[PDB]
Amino acid sequence: EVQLQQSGPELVKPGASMKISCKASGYSFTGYSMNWVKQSHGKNLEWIGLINPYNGDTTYKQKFKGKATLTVDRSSSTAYMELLRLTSEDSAVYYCARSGRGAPTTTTAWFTYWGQGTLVTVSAAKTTPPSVYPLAPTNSMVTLGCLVKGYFPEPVTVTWNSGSLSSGVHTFPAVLQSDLYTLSSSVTVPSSTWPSETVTCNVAHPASSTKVDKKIVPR
Amino acid sequence: DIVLTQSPASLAVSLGQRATISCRASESVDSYGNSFMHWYQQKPGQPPILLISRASNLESGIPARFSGSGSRTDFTLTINPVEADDFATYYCQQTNEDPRTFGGGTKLEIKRADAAPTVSIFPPSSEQLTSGGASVVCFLNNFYPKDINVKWKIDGSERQNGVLNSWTDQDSKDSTYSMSSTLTLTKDEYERHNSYTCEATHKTSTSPIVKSFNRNE
Amino acid sequence: PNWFNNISTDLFSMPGDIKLGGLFPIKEQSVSCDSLNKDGLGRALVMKYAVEEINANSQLLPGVKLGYKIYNTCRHSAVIVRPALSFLTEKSNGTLSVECNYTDYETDMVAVIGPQSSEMVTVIGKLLGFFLMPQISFGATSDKFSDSLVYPSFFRTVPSDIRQVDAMVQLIKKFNWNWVAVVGSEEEYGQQGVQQFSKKAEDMGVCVAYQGLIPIYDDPKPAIQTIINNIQTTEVKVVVVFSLVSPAVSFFEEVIKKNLTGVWIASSSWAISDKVYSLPNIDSIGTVIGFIDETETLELLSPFTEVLFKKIHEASPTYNPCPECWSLSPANVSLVKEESVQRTAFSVYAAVYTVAHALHKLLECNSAACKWSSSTRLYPWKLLEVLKEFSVNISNTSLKFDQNGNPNIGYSVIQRIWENQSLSSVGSYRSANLSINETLFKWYTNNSEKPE
Amino acid sequence: TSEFHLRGDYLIGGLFNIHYVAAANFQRPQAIDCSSKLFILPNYRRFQMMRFSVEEINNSSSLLPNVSLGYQMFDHCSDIHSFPGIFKLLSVNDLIRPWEDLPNAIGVVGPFTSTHALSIAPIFMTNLFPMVSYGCSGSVFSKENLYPSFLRTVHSNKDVINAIVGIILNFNWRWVAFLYSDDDFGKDGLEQFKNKIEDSEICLAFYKAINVNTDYLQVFKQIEEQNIKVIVVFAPKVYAEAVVESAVQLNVTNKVWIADDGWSLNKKLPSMNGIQNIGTVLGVAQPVVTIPGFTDFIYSAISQMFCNQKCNCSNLSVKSLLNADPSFSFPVYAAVYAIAHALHNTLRCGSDRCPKNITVHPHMILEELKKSNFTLLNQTVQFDENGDPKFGSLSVVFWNSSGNAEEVGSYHFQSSIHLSINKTKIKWF
Ligand SMILES: *[C@@H]1O[C@H](CO)[C@@H](O)[C@H](O)[C@H]1NC(C)=O
Ligand SMILES: *[C@@H]1O[C@H](CO)[C@@H](O)[C@H](O)[C@H]1NC(C)=O
Ligand SMILES: *[C@@H]1O[C@H](CO)[C@@H](O)[C@H](O)[C@H]1NC(C)=O
Ligand SMILES: *[C@@H]1O[C@H](CO)[C@@H](O)[C@H](O)[C@H]1NC(C)=O
Ligand SMILES: *[C@@H]1O[C@H](CO)[C@@H](O)[C@H](O)[C@H]1NC(C)=O
Ligand SMILES: *[C@@H]1O[C@H](CO)[C@@H](O)[C@H](O)[C@H]1NC(C)=O
Ligand SMILES: *[C@@H]1O[C@H](CO)[C@@H](O)[C@H](O)[C@H]1NC(C)=O
Ligand SMILES: *[C@@H]1O[C@H](CO)[C@@H](O)[C@H](O)[C@H]1NC(C)=O
Ligand SMILES: *[C@@H]1O[C@H](CO)[C@@H](O)[C@H](O)[C@H]1NC(C)=O
Ligand SMILES: *[C@@H]1O[C@H](CO)[C@@H](O)[C@H](O)[C@H]1NC(C)=O
Ligand SMILES: *[C@@H]1O[C@H](CO)[C@@H](O)[C@H](O)[C@H]1NC(C)=O
Ligand SMILES: *[C@@H]1O[C@H](CO)[C@@H](O)[C@H](O)[C@H]1NC(C)=O
Ligand SMILES: *[C@@H]1O[C@H](CO)[C@@H](O)[C@H](O)[C@H]1NC(C)=O
Ligand SMILES: *[C@@H]1O[C@H](CO)[C@@H](O)[C@H](O)[C@H]1NC(C)=O
Ligand SMILES: NC(=O)CC[C@H](N)C(=O)O
Ligand SMILES: NC(=O)CC[C@H](N)C(=O)O
Ligand SMILES: [Ca+2]
Ligand SMILES: [Cl-]
Ligand code: NA
């Protein structure tokens, strides 16, 4: 089937440039326009432009002219978007998206396939591993937690007991304060299954190559 | 440039009921015998999914409860009956004219019966204290509607600074919201106080839900 | 039947005053043509039955002996061309002379019975059409030949596939299926079948999810894996298989391995093929609904053949399309008992009889004598003039050929019954009318209910 | 003497179709009188090209030294009635014996069209008698097991179809109409088109088999109501002219027309009145290849019984013949030279003499033909295993305001971008 696979999140310096990749598979690459879309955290979708992978022709929305540069590599079926002269207003999620079939022009085509998105954080702040702290406390259900503090950049992931504990889990959206993010996560288990059965949160922060297993230990 | 205006901006609809979402275009988006207005669903943290192309054509794999209608400048997306996983932002998009533009979006909420939060409070861990910080965490879990008020009391006086709050997106099973409130202090300041209270007020009760601990225990 | 006594032992060469050319796929490849095609051999026997019977009828071609020469086509282009050229040699010379005008040219044969397959018709149909030599196919169903401007001397005793694909689409509509795949063999038959079907299916609002062609020359297994992967992907549960037998067998060999189940719509080329139905675990692929030519059973065929094979065996110690046929015995009477031969034998029979009656008319015969002598010169184009739009009763069949060389022959709709290893009759298609009885259908599914 | 036949030490068949007539019912088995039918100037040019080639080689003391090439050439306006000429090429002294393992000819050049080839090729294939076609583009002739002694000096339909798709993809339009001749050539073209665009943004919004009964009023009515702007016309001269002339008469406007190489260099339509009105014509085209000396040959030829060897074209304008559509010129030229070289190499000719009185079998010609490797006018003549040519370019033209087919692009069989187009050369509307 069709898959659009984008490169990973990236922390980049103000004034620098960066290149996003979109690896297309499962269909004939040069047969369809590859579009790019920007989503700021405000959440508006904005069309950046498209590239015809057959001949390299480009069409941009006016405000992205000279700001984004779309290319393709036909030998690896990969579409690229280079962002120039980055500012904090280029911080956003960026999507590639293939045109579908059935529109009368390249201009009218809608988007049937989407890459998974690439988060770009434009900041001079440096990469910092999180600190992971246990959150321990007679109802039949008892709530526990993990505090994931002082990391940068996004993202972190939080599982409980390596995935086995999934229901009754709440993993709250990070909050940025002094160029550092904090999120926390709660899990609710039967009061008869804790402390007798160990509950452990697993936190990972790829950017700093951090993996922490914090067991929730009774006070 | 064509400007797309959606209404309403946000919407709460009960399970089994009908959601109606409008999109109005500044100029006609018709050509080639078609209306080039398309509808997308976006769940938080996920790519948009195409629901409907050319005003009324339901895409392959998309459930039949989704339908579209309209022409020229006025379009409607209908979800009927609404189901528990339909909470999302819905965007319209015109492709009749470069550049493609999207509507600002409509956030569909699943309406359900009101439910009061479960409140849990947590002292700072010794692991944090020994590095010099003291975060006090409060969970307010599985409530509806989303509007809720949280106050922190330290030794009897309400504390306003140092408090960060954060809501989850709607739960896809029971359609509730959850929230965490985190009061961050320094270890020196934490150890200078005894009673720490997290107080929650929600339309489900006129009396607030209070949770406390004392540091010296 | 007393005249069984007077029949001769020659299978593929009968002497006569007037001769027919025979083209049958008797031996094929597995360039070496070494695989006996038993259906092909069986059909050839039907022609010998027809001819021996015609000559024993004192009042059909009374003063005239009908003869023929039958050659193997090997279902191969290089092989069939030579016998087709030999039919055209000057009757008293053995050579084919080069001329611009053949109006007064007496050919060795006066008409051709066969070939069996549509791919073979494309090889020689223009050649024979130039000479206006009547060719009556007992098996080539492609609609391409329905154009007398392109195929000037072509007739057939089986209907065009444009009718069969109409029957298929109607059946699919009746069972309310609207999402199907179509698979053909990669030659004239399967290719035209797939295209005609896709056209009709569109017109009737049936969405064809996928089209596939099975190679007949390559290793077909890679293309088959791709086709089968597309079938699983589209999640279609109705597949139309419009295909010659060897590709079909290879195909279902892979369908079986991958334990696929669904509805399979069989074109007449494999709908009663023992080669398919004898495959290990074919009974696991679900429901096979098929279409075959509506034909009479030739009640005298099996009683003619046993007697012939006894005479062959008798004079057995005494160049060939079937070298090993010298050792045919009464045991080999199974060749015409085989259901694929039994149910199609009439198509061969009607083709020979169609020419015999046309000749009877050409030569202004009655029940006693014909306008014929050893110095009578027979030109194929004159016989063609008689055959155009020909109406003739053959056994209990009122046979009419339209402007296009197509017959008023319909289809039997059939189903494969696994427990029986038999075929049930579930309806018919005549004119442009599908008549099936849904309750007569067996559904090979988890709860014996119709899919969807 | 005659243009259609020339005596030599060895003979080459020429299969041409100088006249055109639509098929019709016939009740007698005999050749058709093509000399009374519609004359076709560019096919006649291609006919002369073969005559020119053979004479050029006979003039050479290097290729086939002291070995003359002769020919038997035919005007087969009807493929079904072409067999008398075909039999003459394959006969031993006006006789064919079907069961034979010294044929009159050693190979044949032609025919021009797929219909002509499909009708007769099995007879040549049986004895591995070599055919080198200067025009047949059917996909099916690339299947070597079906056509083992068939070769061609123009590209298969798949390549032209690829170039046409490359033209479409260079621009912004994605709904396409595909009008194709109601024959083997046209149908194969539609099939390749359908196959090529299936996994692309291109949508085939409308298609139609073109013949004498086409309701052009209705076809263009539908095209207009589907708001289709791009119209591919994949068809031979007679059908392509019917389409475009009907379009002018029905005031079709604002279309983008795309021609295959069989009519992108058409010489009637660019000068027809009103041609401007229907919009813009683009097409895949064979680049003009100059054949030095041909002009002089034509001037000389124009200054001048078996069926289908009669031109009935007296008092032809030399000018009109010279200026006729020159497509398929090098394909004809190269086809004759390939057989010549094959014969030269089969005889084991040296640089200035040939082993004489050597009897040559057509199948020996075949082996050398398939191994062709020689230069001709700075091109390298080779064929792949399928018998398809490894030479000959394709370009993109635009019919410009002075009535010329101006080159505006080049099609690259291998390159990363398969089709380049200088868009500023194209003046639209
Ligand atoms: C047929 O056979 C019978 C005996 O089998 C014989 O008497 C008769 O002569 C034969 N009839 C012919 C050859 O017409
Ligand atoms: C062909 O031959 C027949 C009989 O000889 C004659 O009637 C017919 O006119 C001939 N056609 C020609 C010579 O064109
Ligand atoms: C088909 O069925 C058999 C069991 O009868 C199984 O062993 C095999 O894995 C299956 N093959 C498939 C699913 O391709
Ligand atoms: C005839 O029958 C015998 C056995 O009954 C068999 O060995 C032989 O192959 C058969 N000939 C055929 C099928 O042509
Ligand atoms: C065939 O039989 C029918 C029905 O009896 C009859 O009307 C017709 O004339 C017959 N046709 C012949 C003998 O050619
Ligand atoms: C099985 O047996 C007989 C003949 O084989 C047939 O009449 C009958 O209908 C078959 N049973 C079915 C189809 O269930
Ligand atoms: C269809 O067959 C069923 C068998 O149960 C029967 O009800 C009915 O007689 C048949 N109807 C026909 C043949 O029209
Ligand atoms: C040449 O052609 C014309 C028709 O274009 C015809 O009328 C004339 O008789 C022909 N001359 C011949 C065949 O000698
Ligand atoms: C070949 O030679 C003759 C002179 O003998 C000349 O007239 C003619 O133009 C030449 N033909 C060619 C080069 O095709
Ligand atoms: C050329 O060929 C002729 C026969 O046509 C031969 O007699 C003569 O010897 C040859 N001349 C040469 C090789 O110079
Ligand atoms: C040609 O013009 C007529 C009348 O002006 C109009 O009705 C028709 O639509 C035109 N045909 C086209 C655009 O194909
Ligand atoms: C073709 O010929 C040239 C020299 O004549 C040589 O360079 C090239 O390798 C040859 N190609 C072959 C033998 O495939
Ligand atoms: C049209 O094209 C021809 C040849 O490509 C060129 O010579 C001529 O100048 C062009 N006319 C224009 C561009 O008006
Ligand atoms: C492209 O087209 C323009 C406009 O005619 C022409 O002037 C220019 O030379 C071309 N550019 C090339 C050939 O690089
Ligand atoms: N072998 C066969 O029976 C093939 C018959 C098939 N109807 C065809 O036209 O080719
Ligand atoms: N008419 C043309 O374009 C030349 C012949 C065509 N290529 C064919 O194969 O039939
Ligand atoms: Ca304090
Ligand atoms: Cl056959
Ligand atoms: Na020479």
From TrEMBL, chain C:
Record's subcellular location: Cell membrane
Glycosylated sites: 6, 93, 101, 259, 332, 393, 420, 437
UniProt protein name: Taste receptor type 1 member 3
Keyword DNA repair: no
Name of the coding gene: TAS1R3
Lineage start: Eukaryota, Metazoa, Chordata, Craniata, Vertebrata
Organism name: Oryzias latipes
Superkingdom, taxonomy of origin: Eukaryota
Keyword check for Cell division: no
Key words, A-Z: Cell membrane, G-protein coupled receptor, Glycoprotein, Membrane, Receptor, Signal, Transducer, Transmembrane, Transmembrane helix
Membrane topology: Multi-pass membrane protein
Location (main, coarse): membrane
One cellular-component annotation, GO: plasma membrane
Molecular function terms from GO: G protein-coupled receptor activity
GO BP terms: sensory perception of taste
Coiled-coil residue spans: none
Binding site residues for L-glutamate: 75, 116, 118, 139, 141
Disulfide-linked positions: 33-74, 322-325, 365-370
Family as reported in the entry's similarity comment: Belongs to the G-protein coupled receptor 3 family. TAS1R subfamily.
UniProt: L-glutamine binding residues: 118, 139, 141
From TrEMBL, chain D:
Keyword hit for Membrane: yes
Compartments where located: Cell membrane
Residue pairs linked by disulfide bridges in the UniProt entry: 34-77, 311-313, 349-354
Chain positions recorded as L-glutamate binding sites: 114, 135, 137
Glycosylated residues (UniProt): 59, 66, 251, 312, 373, 378, 400, 422
GO biological process, one term: sensory perception of taste
Keywords attached to this entry: Cell membrane, G-protein coupled receptor, Glycoprotein, Membrane, Receptor, Signal, Transducer, Transmembrane, Transmembrane helix
Chief place of localization: membrane
UniProt binding sites for L-glutamine: 114, 135, 137
GO terms under cellular component: plasma membrane
Bilayer topology: Multi-pass membrane protein
Keyword Translocase in record: no
One MF term in the entry's GO annotations: G protein-coupled receptor activity
Similarity comment: family membership: Belongs to the G-protein coupled receptor 3 family. TAS1R subfamily.
UniProt name for this protein: Taste receptor, type 1, member 2a
Gene source species: Oryzias latipes (Japanese rice fish)
GN (gene name): TAS1R2a
